[PDB]
Amino acid sequence: MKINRQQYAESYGPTVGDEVRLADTDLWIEVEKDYTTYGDEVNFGGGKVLREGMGENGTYTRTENVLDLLLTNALILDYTGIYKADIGVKDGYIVGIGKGGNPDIMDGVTPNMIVGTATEVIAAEGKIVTAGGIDTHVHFINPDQVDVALANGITTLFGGGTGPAEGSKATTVTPGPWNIEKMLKSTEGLPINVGILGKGHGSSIAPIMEQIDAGAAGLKIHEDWGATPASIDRSLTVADEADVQVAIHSDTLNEAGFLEDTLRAINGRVIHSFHVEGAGGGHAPDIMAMAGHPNVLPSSTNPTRPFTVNTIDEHLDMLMVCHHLKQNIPEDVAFADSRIRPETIAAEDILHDLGIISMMSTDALAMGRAGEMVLRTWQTADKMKKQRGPLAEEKNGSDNFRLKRYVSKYTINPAIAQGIAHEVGSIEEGKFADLVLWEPKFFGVKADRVIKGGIIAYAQIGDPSASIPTPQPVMGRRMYGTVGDLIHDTNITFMSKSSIQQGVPAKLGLKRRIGTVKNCRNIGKKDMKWNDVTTDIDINPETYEVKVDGEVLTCEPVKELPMAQRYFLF
């Protein structure tokens, strides 16, 4: 008996060689391999395979190679591959990627992926499954930002802030031991993973270090607190001792130095350069040259992503509004013109496509959109395909190389930068079960279901009074993973090694899972998956033209994007 491929794909999701369109983009991903045994696919329902004595084993207790949860027939999109597999989860972690079911009667069952009495099932046939997004540039300004992030598939928020205080509205900073303690306690009620950044400012070590000991997971150097050579130096000395990451928003004003002075202060130490293109902040006009260096982990923030016809007008005015700048003060106009540059924004598109900028992030509520990191990553990839063509690395027909390069920017790379990739950032055995299911038609736009620690936390679902869950209105809603004490077991608070050793979680009564930040100081650009390119980036101080390998990097802004007015009510 044979099944035609159209009918197979409709029933079980796609298999090897089949392609799927990402939303309404021109991007096609192709199934590279498939772990199934044809005829023994797992599925659940009336008269289906996962029934006792059949695809469900009726013999084994939970400890005996049985799963807590099986996602059947997933199309995985990850830095590790684009492929078809069942995903097995146990104790909140991914324990198996392969083929689930019952070894009694099925061929090819992965030995620790037994469906048993203890096993829940999520049908992933016809869905794309990715890791949860890791947003490393979050300003904690308004708690309503969490659902916004979850709805676009983000599952970890790294950053700082105490709410809508000016320090926090400007900088990803929770300053000092007391504010840090308060925000660790607030975090107990946020249905998302969290890590908190302290203020990377001071000329003595102790005031900076005591934040790490209090429970910060990293530091932010920000020009609004003085991004001076001294603050840069002390923060990196702390970070090297503490094994945490430092993010920087550099001295746009060039007040205490130019880019080369900031690099001298860094002195070859590892650093995460936020909004590296510079519209979001940094040494005018040449900050983006940071992304060429081996010790720099470079990210973009999302409003420049990608370069469109409204980008400049929007940014010039956004900047003037936010800094209370006046159009009739020439220094204000000069500042704005030095900071918002089509030459560097256009080059930023291309640097992403080339693997020179390694990460995406939001800048949520400060100069960026909490629910558009994933969205804008794919809009960028689509624009680059249209303007630059398939990458040379592609094996005819598919966009798999580009898809792996771009998915890495908001999943594994930010996790590696922050020292948390042992726990999150990819679909790999041994990592926390933060997983996002997407219908291909909504891919990158609106998540179907967001799984946190192996329990659904957020879902697009309908009328709670209806006979079935699909009648209108279908909207994003918090699910049982967020309710009661389950919010503690399905989310991680990431903290410094020292705060954990000093018993801060017990002192504060933290009940969430505690994650350790580690292996942040011994990495570089080379460790950024699919985005590991170092090169000399030249930014002309007169024209702002960007050159790499002797060639000007330029492209046009687009008038329309996919993943836009077809989907959104406003």
């Binding site: 044979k2 004595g53 695809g55 891919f443």
Partner: protein, 122 residues
């Protein structure tokens, strides 16, 4: 170049299910007065007592149909079905409690089936 969001572009060819496993065709009759529908992965010898077929020919086998589909027998309906071999360890537990071990134990399975009134033990 009309865009259907999320559309598939499947490869050429067809998918062969249960490749390399022995296939067997048998006649099966619903002798009851109510409909019986049989799934792809039930040990075939353990189906409803009122299905009449050579029960020995169901041992260690299941329907050779796509995973998650079923064969339907209306009241009084007789038809041929194609079976394939069970895989993995070729053991069955539970269901109708006719096997509870290796499917190689044909005499024991048939003894149990006969005692309990599963039609077609020969």
């Amino acid at each position: 170049n009309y865009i259907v969001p999320g559309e598939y572009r499947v490869a050429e060819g067809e998918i062969e299910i249960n490749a390399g496993r022995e296939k067997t065709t048998i006649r099966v009759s619903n002798t009851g007065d109510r409909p019986i529908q049989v799934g792809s992965h039930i040990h075939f010898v353990e189906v409803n007592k009122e299905l009449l077929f050579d029960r020995a020919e169901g041992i260690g086998r299941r329907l050779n149909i796509p995973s998650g589909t079923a064969a339907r027998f209306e009241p009084g309906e007789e038809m041929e079905v194609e079976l394939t071999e069970l895989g993995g360890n070729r053991e069955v537990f539970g269901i109708s409690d006719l096997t509870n071990g290796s499917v190689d134990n044909k005499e024991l399975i048939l003894q149990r089936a006969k005692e309990l009134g599963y039609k077609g033990v020969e």
